[PDB]
Design a protein around this ligand. Structure first.
Ligand SMILES: CC(=O)N[C@H]1[C@H](OCC(C)C)OC(C(=O)O)=C[C@@H]1O
Length: 347
């Protein structure tokens, strides 16, 4: 694999098993919040202080987000987000005991230390369609906050829809313009799209929300939005971003300040038929589908779900990246930290 600043497991199978990582960077505190599902199923958390001089992040003790759950329900798919205009930390998740899935959220005003009680967002965020679905989910992974005047909150999601045939999945985004006070359900993207993530890319003059989703084909599906996620113009398959047919695998995408507005970074297993070899792909001409690069190798061996966070400027001057990913046959969640220079010397 390529050179990295740090490589350590932060969650490890033992008394419990850990899966479905989500990473969040709190810019002003130079630190990260690493969430995971603890499988009696809850969401756990780990806070890490990043120290540049020593090129390392120090992880504190694992904690349970006691408030992120409903009585008699298991919690899944932790989707974190930090509101830069309020200083409020959001943690969206799914609670499960014919649709019976619930959308929830818990907030923290002290950087994750404590959390408000949950808020069941289901009925108002979904409406009548709720009955037309089999189930649904958000993320997993970090969410997105836009540049629009209202600094809208965009939460990536997908739903299993029912038209004889099994429910077909379609990605979409939950949108809030009042800082998570109310929520609207965005429009689906091409059918058969699942777990996805969204990144904002300011190109030309207008904002462009790019969406990268898991599919049932040998390739990834990517869609674009010019209306903050309400509608996703069109979606194209991206041959350069493989999906092992077994059923595919969740992937992560983020935007970051270009070295010369922003570029995209994407992580996902690179093996054609197996969930192995975590690779990093770079898109310097976002969101062009054909601009995606060959993958650079980050981790060898079995790798599954992952989540990326832009961490500012790295020790070498280039963009810094933190990555949380499932590994060794789901025996742990590994935290990886590296720079644009370490991953793409040529760019
Ligand atoms: C909410 C939930 O059950 N998520 C599952 C996810 O469902 C994929 C379906 C929708 C095709 O599958 C996997 C997986 O290892 O591929 C682990 C997640 O925990």
């Amino acid at each position: 694999s390529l050179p990295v600043l740090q490589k350590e497991s932060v969650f490890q199978s033992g008394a419990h098993a850990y899966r479905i990582p989500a990473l969040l960077y709190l810019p002003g505190q130079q630190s990260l919040l690493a969430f995971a599902e603890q499988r009696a199923e809850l969401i756990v958390l780990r806070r890490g202080d990043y120290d540049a001089p020593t090129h390392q992040v120090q992880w504190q003790a694992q904690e349970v987000v006691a408030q992120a759950r409903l009585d008699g329900h298991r919690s899944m798919n932790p989707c974190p987000l930090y509101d830069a205009q309020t200083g409020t930390l959001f943690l969206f998740f799914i609670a499960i005991p014919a649709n019976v899935t619930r959308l929830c959220q818990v907030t923290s005003t002290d950087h994750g230390r404590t959390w408000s009680s949950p808020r069941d967002l289901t009925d108002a965020a979904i409406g009548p369609a709720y009955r037309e679905w089999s189930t649904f989910a958000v993320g997993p992974g970090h969410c997105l906050q836009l540049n629009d005047r209202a600094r809208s909150l965009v939460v990536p999601a997908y739903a299993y829809r029912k038209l004889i045939q099994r429910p077909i999945p379609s990605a979409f985004c939950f949108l809030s313009h009042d800082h998570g006070r109310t929520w609207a359900r965005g429009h689906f993207v091409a059918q058969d799209t699942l777990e996805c993530q969204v990144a904002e890319v300011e190109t030309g003059e207008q904002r462009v929300v790019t969406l990268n989703a898991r599919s049932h084909l040998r390739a990834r599906v990517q869609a674009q939005s010019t209306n903050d996620g309400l509608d996703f113009q069109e979606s194209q398959l991206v041959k350069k971003l493989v999906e092992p047919p077994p059923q595919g695998c969740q992937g992560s995408v983020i935007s970051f300040p270009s070295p010369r507005a922003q570029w995209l970074l994407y992580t996902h297993p690179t093996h054609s038929w197996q969930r192995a070899d975590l690779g990093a792909y770079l898109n310097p001409r976002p969101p062009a589908p054909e601009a995606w690069s060959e993958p650079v190798l980050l981790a060898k061996g079995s790798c599954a779900y992952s989540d990326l966070q832009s961490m500012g400027t790295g020790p070498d001057g280039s963009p810094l990246f933190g990555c949380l990913y499932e590994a060794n046959d789901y025996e742990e969640i590994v935290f990886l930290m590296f720079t644009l220079k370490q991953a793409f010397p040529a760019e």
